[PDB]
């Protein structure tokens, strides 16, 4: 329906960078969000010759450059434009009971220094025995620590197959460090097995975390790896 | 901004019936919406909502013009149901669409058998799992160098056995102490 590109990206303060939205829906309308912890208009654009402010537009430009597509633009990225960002479209914001249908969101993180950018370190945790003995079940633990921005996926692989029945992954991740504008971040996430399953020696437990961090074309000075979008797999055996 | 929604969150049991409300300030708004938001995720649209009240399954939306509010009710309430759930309303002439702040619903399993138990595990140094609790004890934030989980409800399908479960760790630190801040059911589970 509605594509927005990039969905993830960390900026150095003071750098550009523009948001790309496409609808294949043939709308008229088409419009941009952020949303902090709801949804402000920033600009929209009511058909495909014109544009026009909406409540937030300082520090942001935007060209419908033809009836499919609305970029935004950010001219010099400061910290408070830290946000989600949602295109929307709409077949015509003039008519009775115009539907919008949003993009996918991109979450954007402003940074003074991308030396504050950090892949996560990925753990698994095995069961507890005695879990184990007392409930027959197994629940083991995938942690993602120490990780900046908070731009993870985290998924679980059995046996070389993605699970989700007995996993939960917290809502969010958590800020080691609350105070801190420049936190590193935590993420958590469980899978529970029947006893018998974790006892099988041949099961393999993989934890894997998706995270989206500088592009190939950002630069690095820093003595340690350069932080790039990865992923990040830690695993289990079973055991009897 | 002038769509006013309850301020949730909302806690209703699984199976149960819930209920939203939104008042808005313009009586000459044309079109109202109940958009629902997934945590991480983008806006989707839930129902147009009518004076005519409107019924798409376990979901009934309803307008009330003279009052100026519109209501969501859905029955038999999923686990799949949370979410937050936005009032949109088109005011149609000089102004554009609002959506509110929303409000966020979580649809809470009842656990038959809690077994309130906290684990220790081992890294493949050291997690603490609390677990199989009911779903009415409450996981609390107090030390800043012990990381603890919000509650995290995991559906075992093949089984059909449900249970809720927080993370605890720290660099510093014993399991037994872990979630002290939280009233623990005496008798919880703490292995030799």
């Known amino acids: 329906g509605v594509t927005q590109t990039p969905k993830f990206q960390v900026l150095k303060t003071g750098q550009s960078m523009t948001l790309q939205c496409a609808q294949d829906?043939?709308?008229?309308?088409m419009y941009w969000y952020r949303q902090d912890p709801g949804l402000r208009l920033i600009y929209y654009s009511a058909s495909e010759g014109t544009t026009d402010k909406g409540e937030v537009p300082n520090g942001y430009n935007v060209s419908r450059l033809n009836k499919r597509e609305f970029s935004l633009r950010l001219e010099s990225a400061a910290p408070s434009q830290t946000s989600v960002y949602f295109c929307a479209s709409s077949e015509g914001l003039w008519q009775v009971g115009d539907e919008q249908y949003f993009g996918p969101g991109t979450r954007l993180t402003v940074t003074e220094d991308l030396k504050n950018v950090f892949p996560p370190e990925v753990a698994v945790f095995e069961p507890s025995e005695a879990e184990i003995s007392h409930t027959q079940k197994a629940t083991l633990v995938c942690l993602a620590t120490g990780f900046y921005p908070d731009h993870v996926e985290l998924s679980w692989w059995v046996n070389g197959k993605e699970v989700h029945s007995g996993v939960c992954t917290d809502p969010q991740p958590l800020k080691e460090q609350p105070a801190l504008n420049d936190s590193r971040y935590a993420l958590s996430s469980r899978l529970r097995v029947s006893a018998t399953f974790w006892q099988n020696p041949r099961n393999h437990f993989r934890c894997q975390v998706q995270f989206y961090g500088l592009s190939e074309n950002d630069e690095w000075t820093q003595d340690r790896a350069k932080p790039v979008t990865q992923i990040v797999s830690a695993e289990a055996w079973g055991r009897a | 901004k002038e769509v006013e929604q309850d301020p949730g969150p909302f806690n209703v049991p699984e199976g149960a019936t819930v209920a939203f409300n939104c008042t808005y300030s313009?009586?000459?708004?044309?079109?109202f919406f109940w958009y629902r938001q997934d945590c991480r995720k983008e806006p989707k649209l839930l129902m147009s909502v009518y004076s005519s009240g409107n019924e798409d399954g376990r979901f009934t939306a309803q307008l009330n013009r003279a009052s100026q509010y519109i209501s969501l009710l859905i029955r038999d309430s999923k686990l799949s149901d949370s979410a937050t759930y936005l009032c949109?309303?088109?005011?149609?002439?000089?102004?554009?669409?609002?959506f509110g702040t929303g409000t966020k619903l979580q649809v809470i399993p009842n656990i038959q058998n809690p077994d309130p138990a906290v684990y220790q595990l081992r890294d493949s140094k050291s997690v603490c799992l609390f677990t199989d609790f009911d779903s009415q004890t409450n996981v609390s934030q107090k030390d800043s160098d012990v990381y603890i989980t919000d509650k995290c409800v995991l559906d075992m399908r093949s089984m059909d056995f449900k249970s809720n479960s927080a993370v605890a760790w720290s660099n510093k630190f014993a399991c037994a102490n872990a979630f002290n801040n939280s009233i623990i059911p005496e008798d919880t589970f703490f292995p030799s």
């Open positions: 313009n009586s000459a708004s044309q079109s």
């Open positions: 829906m043939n709308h008229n309308s």
């Open positions: 949109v309303v088109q005011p149609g002439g000089y102004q554009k669409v609002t």
